[PDB]
Paper text:
Here we present several high-resolution structures of [name] 70S ribosomes programmed by templates carrying missense errors. The collection of our structures puts forward a decoding mechanism that, for the first time, sets the molecular basis behind the phenomenon of translational infidelity and is in good agreement with in vivo studies of the missense errors that occur during protein synthesis. Our models suggest an advanced mechanism of decoding that, for the first time, describes how a missense error can skip discrimination, leading to translational infidelity. Our data provide evidence that steric complementarity and shape acceptance but not the number of hydrogen bonds between the decoding centre and a codon–anticodon duplex play the discriminatory role during decoding.
In this control complex, where [name] programmed the ribosome with the AAA codon in the A-site and where tRNAPhe with the GAG anticodon was given as a substrate, no binding of tRNAPhe to the A-site was detected.
Numbering used by the authors:
A (entry chain 11): 2 to 273
B (entry chain P8): 1 to 47
RNA sequence: UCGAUGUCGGCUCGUCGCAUCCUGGGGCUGAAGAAGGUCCCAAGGGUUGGGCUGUUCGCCCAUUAAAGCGGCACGCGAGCU
RNA sequence: CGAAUGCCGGCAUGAGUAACGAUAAAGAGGGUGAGAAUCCCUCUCGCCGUAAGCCCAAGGGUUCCUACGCAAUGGUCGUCAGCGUAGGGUUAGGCGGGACCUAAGGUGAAGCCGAAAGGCGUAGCCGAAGGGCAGCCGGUUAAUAUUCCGGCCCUUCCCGCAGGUGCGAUGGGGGGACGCUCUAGGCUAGGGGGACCGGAGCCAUGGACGAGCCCGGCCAGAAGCGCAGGGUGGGAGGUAGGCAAAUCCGCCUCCCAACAAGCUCUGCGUGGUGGGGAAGCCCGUACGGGUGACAACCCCCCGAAGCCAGGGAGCCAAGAAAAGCCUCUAAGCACAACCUGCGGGAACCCGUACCGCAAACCGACACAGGUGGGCGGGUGCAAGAGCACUCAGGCGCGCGGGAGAACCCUCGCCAAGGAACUCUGCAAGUUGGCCCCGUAACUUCGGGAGAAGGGGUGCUCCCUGGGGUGAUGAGCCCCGGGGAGCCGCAGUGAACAGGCUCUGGCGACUGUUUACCAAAAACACAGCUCUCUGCGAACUCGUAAGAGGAGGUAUAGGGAGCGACGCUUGCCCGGUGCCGGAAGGUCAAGGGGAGGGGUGCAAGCCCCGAACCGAAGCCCCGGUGAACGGCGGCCGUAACUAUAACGGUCCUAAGGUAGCGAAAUUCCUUGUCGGGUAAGUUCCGACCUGCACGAAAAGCGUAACGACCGGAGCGCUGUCUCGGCGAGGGACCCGGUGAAAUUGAACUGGCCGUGAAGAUGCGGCCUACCCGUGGCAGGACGAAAAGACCCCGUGGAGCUUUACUGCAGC
RNA sequence: CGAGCUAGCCCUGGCCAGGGUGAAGCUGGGGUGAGACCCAGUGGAGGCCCGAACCGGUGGGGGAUGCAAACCCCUCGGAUG
RNA sequence: GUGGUUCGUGGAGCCAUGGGGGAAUCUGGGCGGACCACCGCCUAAGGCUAAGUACUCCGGGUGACCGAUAGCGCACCAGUA
RNA sequence: CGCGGGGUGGAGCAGCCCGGUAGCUCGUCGGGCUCAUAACCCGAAGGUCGUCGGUUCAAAUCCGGCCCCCGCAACCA
RNA sequence: CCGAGGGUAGGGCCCGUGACUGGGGCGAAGUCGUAACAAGGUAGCUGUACCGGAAGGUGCGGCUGG
RNA sequence: GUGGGAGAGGGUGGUGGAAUUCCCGGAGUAGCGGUGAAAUGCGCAGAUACCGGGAGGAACGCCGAUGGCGAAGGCAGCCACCUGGUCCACCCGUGACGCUGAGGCGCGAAAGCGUGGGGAGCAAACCGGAUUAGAUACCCGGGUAGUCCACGCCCUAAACG
């Protein structure tokens, strides 16, 4: 894991690349890819609604499967492990015996060669997807639906996971990858395991350009603008924030809690 | 050094031409205006 | 003088004043000699090269007969910087 | 009308002045003509040649070719022209685009939203310098040609014949179909040599009849074939997936091939045939043509970045779509239909001139500027698209003639000295290519490093190793190795081609920036921290629908600071902000009606109204520092003196820790000392009295990097002592063309006074014949700009906030 | 009414002579209990080096009713990101 | 909660209506400037309606209207160059 | 020279504002505990409020001058 | 040819010296406290770590030389 | 060699309960903590004590001993795997094949370091209440690194018999 470099240039010193030994196949499943329209941060009016985006290598989108109850009870053999340029994680190729192939988001410690199944049945194992109600408690799980039939949403990023800490009535208690404590519905499919590529968090971009390749462009500080531009613009040399610190648009950026309070969602949440 | 006029035969009609003045009510009035002043040309001519 | 009289310093080119730095001529001396002091006359000419600082000024190095003080929009940017 | 830096027009002055637009450069003969430096032809000279040559795309739109013209346009001239008039000129089933596909985006039946105008939007549709598609060599015109002609190839549609098969689609499946760097084999383009082939000719001026000299030695081409290469397994069984179905595709199993073996596709070769085909001489062309010729038509070498091509390897940042194409089946229809081959017929619209790094495009100009793709020969220097010369081809820049002043510009050289110049070595010099030796502190071990400093460099003869091509051999091409000699001041002999070291500051670094006075110590940067955000996320845009975020999910996304890395980042929560707090306080509409009132005969209608219940906010409670921020005063004390480890007391929310310190911060100030210098307000080292450093508006260091900013040496210099001479382009004289700001009028002198206080204009005096040229800048408070500084105006605008008052948002 | 200048982004194409340095990995040899590692070859990475095209605009002179309403000469920065 | 009216919250009615409530059909309902009695006026919650009125692209008539810097911007091949 | 704050027993601070009536800690002197010192305990002393002027009955206190200390400012030029 | 040496360039070691600075030694009777020696009045010492005018204080672990 | 034994020897993966702390819930009231005595702290916004649920980390009570094990450092709930050293019986094999050991190599308590993760209790530093002349200590209330885990460094010690 985590390939380093001799410093035969600066920026090649502290730089770091992932280890692709996991990656078993170097071109994707033409059947399962579709093209990715790159936004540039712009929305349906040619307006930038997210700052500092664009540039960066073109990507092909892998259409990946987050509902696993299409295929209930069918198994599949894990065919390949691939690079997915659109996510932290890696994707698994898996041929269902159905003859139907899909991509899956690859759990940690999932060999090529595994059979894998999805359903209320099904053994408690890496790759396997069940409703939450049949996962035994204290099981480490990932790629969880929030509400039934709606698709995996939680714990999908490289190294992420969730624990099933309990059950109460129709619902079950999870610790999220953020340590929030959430009730989720019995009938939500979650595939067991953590996600892995867990070493993802140690990569060191190492040089400016490598940040461009991921399509994020320079971020210039409020501090360095003029008043027209930012709450922190101005002041002759440097100068400190001179007010409670703020976003360009003017709301306070240290401590302000933005979660809408009257969300009904909130009955189902117990933590930080 | 590179100047303000970089003539391109398509942009012009694409931009200021007649079919384009007519989709925007803004431009329909451009025409209304021009036509009533008796412009010989309501639109730049092309090619 | 604001329907504009470009500001410090330098360089260039100077000209003028004398309340004289030096050279010429003087009185007095607490002037033996040499060399000084101090005041008078005298504007003819002369009045160095460098280290530092934008500096003018100043301080300093090495000299000198001496290494003068001023005015000319603090001389001079339709002459330069 | 006399004034408004008035308005519109006319004409002056400046003035025969400055200019005539690249310093690539001209000269002469002859022709035409009213007229010739300027037009045509010849000759000689110079200039481009990874162009200043040639071909495409934009844009331009008759500029194209011919005849007749010269008033205007042409920076002069014009007999010429891109100018006037007139006439001619653009030929396509295969080139480009359309009766083909889709991309961003646009549009938009369904749908959704919005006072109206309108906004969104799945499908479809439109949209190309991308995907798909069938033409190559030559000849002809004054002017068009892959367009016409000639030779040889090819596509699609319609109809028919023959043979074959369940045919059949907008549907299913395959394919189209892909990045970056490096790169194998074999070709081609292109190029060099040849003693061989072909060829007009030539022997000068001392020599040469020669294996002399000069010229040239190919192009295109179906099938078939041959050489390199691309693509692709075959059979069956099962079959629940590919929104119907499928024999297809997917998946499992079994059996064969493992390789291109077979099938297939493309490149190149050869190819029936077809075509070109020099120098030179002659002819007369404005420019082409006669013969050369019956031309020759071949070996060798170099060799792509191009081709086989979807080739191969590696890497992470992970690399379009749809149709054409093939296959599969559904309706349907199967005397259909489709597949194959052959034959006949049918084949539309638009562009095609010319310019195209520019005198035809964008820059008011025949403007030293800008403008995308391709080709871009030869020799030499290591390479090369570099530099020098040079071919084809194209040019001498649309004012000239002379003179040989000051001064200017751009160059060249310089006795002795060598930074003394100066804000500063600014400028300029020195250095310089390659081969070899050799190379420090320090370091993140890569670097530092072209460190530094040195040696070599040509020519000639002899000996000689390996490589690619050839057979292993000659020849040819490439890399060398040793020996002896020759010549000059000098051998990278001209041209292109780093000056170097020591040492601070700031910034880690390559990058970004004020188009057009700032390129930087500023921005950005990987990286650290805080903080928000459970996903119909936060946040942004939008009245909204919708969209971005993201077809992402906390190893994610947003916001803020800090800014590689090393070592670190102390103390204060009183105020402010944010976070938590069921209580208490206070509080809006609302609820509540005690009680009061108007009016009526009255039942009534109407109005007012205290307690009490009643959000958020604020108050109160607490937390919070990589949140806004803040981090003391006086007095004494040690056995010389000084100072004060110690103490006292007043205050605070707490009293500045480390480290650093006269600093990009130090006022006093050129502090004091030390170092460098003959001399140092700068610079380096240190002290601490820090006016007024101090820890993520980070503190102190740091190798490497810097067109950043200081200081110092070496080297070398016209920077200087201090100037000189020389070159060209101007300046000057002559011929041609001929502006400009400015301008109350002018017959426009000095001094000393006076004057609104700085007089050619008033006083007194002095000087002074009229008018010019080339020169200098002291003066006309010279020109320019209705002063930007400063003040005024109850003038304006950008910006801020615990100014006022509102609105969005929450 | 304007993004035919200019700033960003999206889609699709194209361009970067020539030299230099020599990372990983691979292979071999040494090492060892096995390793680490060491050496050598090969290999060919990099906001690496020098330098044309191309993109810039460092300093200086010229220009200043200009060739030019931002140009010219010399010098200089990047040049596989 | 607003708008209209002379009415700017004012004793603020009338006319209109975004929100909450929410009737009756002659003895039913609105109005005369908060509200109450009295006395009057008038019959909302559907529609149509010439003329008298505004303007002048066009035609005509007339000017103590202009006469080519005037009069339309255009007397002329002008919304042109 | 400007604005604002101060000057009180020996040292450091209250009191001044709102006139009468000067307090707090330490130090000092006397006693005590101790072998003795410090600590510790008990007692005590000590002042004209910078100064000169005025106001009042009366002034540290209200007012003005002068002298001082602390702080702030000294901009466009 | 070689050549004493001379000159130019760049390294290594050793000596001396240097504003200032670090600690150390020593010095009849200075200042501050009381760490250790008697449960030295918190058992002592100990490696390390953070702090603190100063001896030293505390954390973790160890030693008994209680 | 054969057979045979004891053991907290080491490495890995699991797992149990006791207590602490936070949380939810119930009841229930005016104090609880703390000390030499206290104060800071906590509590009517419902604390302490009590009960039921849950989360999480660390350490393993009686057995346990003046015991065992290891070369040293060191090693203690329980279970399984892999695994080192060591002793005994029998006298079966080989025939001096030994001892030590400069360098070298490796292990090496705690505390410290790096990059992640984990953080209940404890706790340098720090803040506060006390004590003192003072108290940057000793006592008390708070409390961050750290203690734990993985990987990688550090190489020290009254590392002592
Ligand atoms: Mg739009
Ligand atoms: Mg970022
Ligand atoms: Mg930034
Ligand atoms: Mg700024
Ligand atoms: Mg703006
Ligand atoms: Mg603002
Ligand atoms: Mg600010
Ligand atoms: Mg500014
Ligand atoms: Mg500042
Ligand atoms: Mg700023
Ligand atoms: Mg959160
Ligand atoms: Mg224009
Ligand atoms: Mg076009
Ligand atoms: Mg017309
Ligand atoms: Mg003035
Ligand atoms: Mg004037
Ligand atoms: Mg003037
Ligand atoms: Mg005199
Ligand atoms: Mg004399
Ligand atoms: Mg004399
Ligand atoms: Mg004498
Ligand atoms: Mg004189
Ligand atoms: Mg004189
Ligand atoms: Mg000097
Ligand atoms: Mg100087
Ligand atoms: Mg001075
Ligand atoms: Mg002098
Ligand atoms: Mg002057
Ligand atoms: Mg000037
Ligand atoms: Mg003047
Ligand atoms: Mg003339
Ligand atoms: Mg003149
Ligand atoms: Mg002249
Ligand atoms: Mg002239
Ligand atoms: Mg004739
Ligand atoms: Mg060439
Ligand atoms: Mg065209
Ligand atoms: Mg034109
Ligand atoms: Mg014409
Ligand atoms: Mg012509
Ligand atoms: Mg003419
Ligand atoms: Mg013509
Ligand atoms: Mg044809
Ligand atoms: Mg048709
Ligand atoms: Mg089309
Ligand atoms: Mg289409
Ligand atoms: Mg519709
Ligand atoms: Mg639309
Ligand atoms: Mg769309
Ligand atoms: Mg196309
Ligand atoms: Mg195409
Ligand atoms: Mg075609
Ligand atoms: Mg032609
Ligand atoms: Mg042709
Ligand atoms: Mg033809
Ligand atoms: Mg059938
Ligand atoms: Mg079929
Ligand atoms: Mg078909
Ligand atoms: Mg050929
Ligand atoms: Mg040849
Ligand atoms: Mg011959
Ligand atoms: Mg012949
Ligand atoms: Mg001869
Ligand atoms: Mg012959
Ligand atoms: Mg098969
Ligand atoms: Mg079958
Ligand atoms: Mg089916
Ligand atoms: Mg062939
Ligand atoms: Mg390939
Ligand atoms: Mg289609
Ligand atoms: Mg049928
Ligand atoms: Mg043509
Ligand atoms: Mg043509
Ligand atoms: Mg050009
Ligand atoms: Mg070109
Ligand atoms: Mg040309
Ligand atoms: Mg031309
Ligand atoms: Mg010209
Ligand atoms: Mg031009
Ligand atoms: Mg170009
Ligand atoms: Mg060439
Ligand atoms: Mg060559
Ligand atoms: Mg060369
Ligand atoms: Mg060239
Ligand atoms: Mg030629
Ligand atoms: Mg010329
Ligand atoms: Mg010319
Ligand atoms: Mg000389
Ligand atoms: Mg000389
Ligand atoms: Mg010298
Ligand atoms: Mg000097
Ligand atoms: Mg000087
Ligand atoms: Mg220079
Ligand atoms: Mg040079
Ligand atoms: Mg090196
Ligand atoms: Mg080295
Ligand atoms: Mg060298
Ligand atoms: Mg030689
Ligand atoms: Mg020679
Ligand atoms: Mg020689
Ligand atoms: Mg030269
Ligand atoms: Mg050179
Ligand atoms: Mg060089
Ligand atoms: Mg400095
Ligand atoms: Mg930088
Ligand atoms: Mg910037
Ligand atoms: Mg600029
Ligand atoms: Mg500007
Ligand atoms: Mg600049
Ligand atoms: Mg720069
Ligand atoms: Mg909004
Ligand atoms: Mg969305
Ligand atoms: Mg998306
Ligand atoms: Mg974040
Ligand atoms: Mg910053
Ligand atoms: Mg801090
Ligand atoms: Mg502190
Ligand atoms: Mg605070
Ligand atoms: Mg607080
Ligand atoms: Mg607070
Ligand atoms: Mg709150
Ligand atoms: Mg309350
Ligand atoms: Mg109320
Ligand atoms: Mg009420
Ligand atoms: Mg409230
Ligand atoms: Mg508080
Ligand atoms: Mg300090
Ligand atoms: Mg220091
Ligand atoms: Mg200092
Ligand atoms: Mg100094
Ligand atoms: Mg300072
Ligand atoms: Mg000295
Ligand atoms: Mg000195
Ligand atoms: Mg000194
Ligand atoms: Mg300076
Ligand atoms: Mg210094
Ligand atoms: Mg600072
Ligand atoms: Mg600060
Ligand atoms: Mg700060
Ligand atoms: Mg900084
Ligand atoms: Mg620093
Ligand atoms: Mg540095
Ligand atoms: Mg740079
Ligand atoms: Mg720079
Ligand atoms: Mg000179
Ligand atoms: Mg000269
Ligand atoms: Mg000359
Ligand atoms: Mg006068
Ligand atoms: Mg007169
Ligand atoms: Mg008079
Ligand atoms: Mg006069
Ligand atoms: Mg004259
Ligand atoms: Mg003058
Ligand atoms: Mg002049
Ligand atoms: Mg004015
Ligand atoms: Mg105003
Ligand atoms: Mg407000
Ligand atoms: Mg653009
Ligand atoms: Mg290697
Ligand atoms: Mg090996
Ligand atoms: Mg590079
Ligand atoms: Mg090119
Ligand atoms: Mg450009
Ligand atoms: Mg730029
Ligand atoms: Mg420049
Ligand atoms: Mg210049
Ligand atoms: Mg000039
Ligand atoms: Mg560079
Ligand atoms: Mg370069
Ligand atoms: Mg790119
Ligand atoms: Mg109203
Ligand atoms: Mg109203
Ligand atoms: Mg209503
Ligand atoms: Mg009424
Ligand atoms: Mg009434
Ligand atoms: Mg009525
Ligand atoms: Mg009319
Ligand atoms: Mg008339
Ligand atoms: Mg007229
Ligand atoms: Mg008119
Ligand atoms: Mg007239
Ligand atoms: Mg007019
Ligand atoms: Mg008429
Ligand atoms: Mg007309
Ligand atoms: Mg006493
Ligand atoms: Mg020697
Ligand atoms: Mg102790
Ligand atoms: Mg003691
Ligand atoms: Mg003790
Ligand atoms: Mg402590
Ligand atoms: Mg300790
Ligand atoms: Mg035996
Ligand atoms: Mg035996
Ligand atoms: Mg250890
Ligand atoms: Mg430890
Ligand atoms: Mg530390
Ligand atoms: Mg740690
Ligand atoms: Mg404690
Ligand atoms: Mg505690």
């Amino acid at each position: 894991a985590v390939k380093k470099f001799k410093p035969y240039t600066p920026s090649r010193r502290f730089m770091t690349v992932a280890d692709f030994s996991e990656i078993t196949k170097t071109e994707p499943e033409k059947s399962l890819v579709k093209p990715l329209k790159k936004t540039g941060g712009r929305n349906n009016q040619g307006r930038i609604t997210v700052r500092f985006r664009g540039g960066g290598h073109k990507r092909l989108y892998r259409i990946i499967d987050f509902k696993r109850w299409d295929k209930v009870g069918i198994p599949a053999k894990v065919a390949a492990i691939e690079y997915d340029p659109n996510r932290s994680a890696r994707i698994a190729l898996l041929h269902y015996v159905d003859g139907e192939k899909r991509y899956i988001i690859a759990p940690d410690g999932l060999q090529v060669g595994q059979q894998v199944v999805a359903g209320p049945d099904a053994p408690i194992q890496v790759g396997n997807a069940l409703p939450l109600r049949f996962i035994p408690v204290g099981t480490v799980v990932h790629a969880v639906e929030l509400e039934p039939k709606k698709g995996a949403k939680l714990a999908r990023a490289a190294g992420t996971s969730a624990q099933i800490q309990g059950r109460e009535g129709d619902y079950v208690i999870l610790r999220l990858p953020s340590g929030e404590l959430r009730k989720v519905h019995g009938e939500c499919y979650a595939t067991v395991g953590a996600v892995g590529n867990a070493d993802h968090k140690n990569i060191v971009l190492g040089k400016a350009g490598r940040s461009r390749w991921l399509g994020r462009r320079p971020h210039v500080r409020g501090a360095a603008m003029n008043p027209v531009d930012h709450p922190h613009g101005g002041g002759e040399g440097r100068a400190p924030r001179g007010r409670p610190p703020a976003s360009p648009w003017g709301w306070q950026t240290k401590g302000l809690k933005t979660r809408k309070r009257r969300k009904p969602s909130s009955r189902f949440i117990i933590a930080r | 050094m590179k100047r303000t006029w970089q003539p391109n035969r398509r942009k012009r009609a694409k931009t200021h031409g007649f079919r384009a003045r007519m989709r925007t009510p803004g431009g329909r009035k451009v025409l209304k205006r021009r036509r009533q002043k008796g412009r010989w040309r309501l639109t730049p001519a092309v090619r």
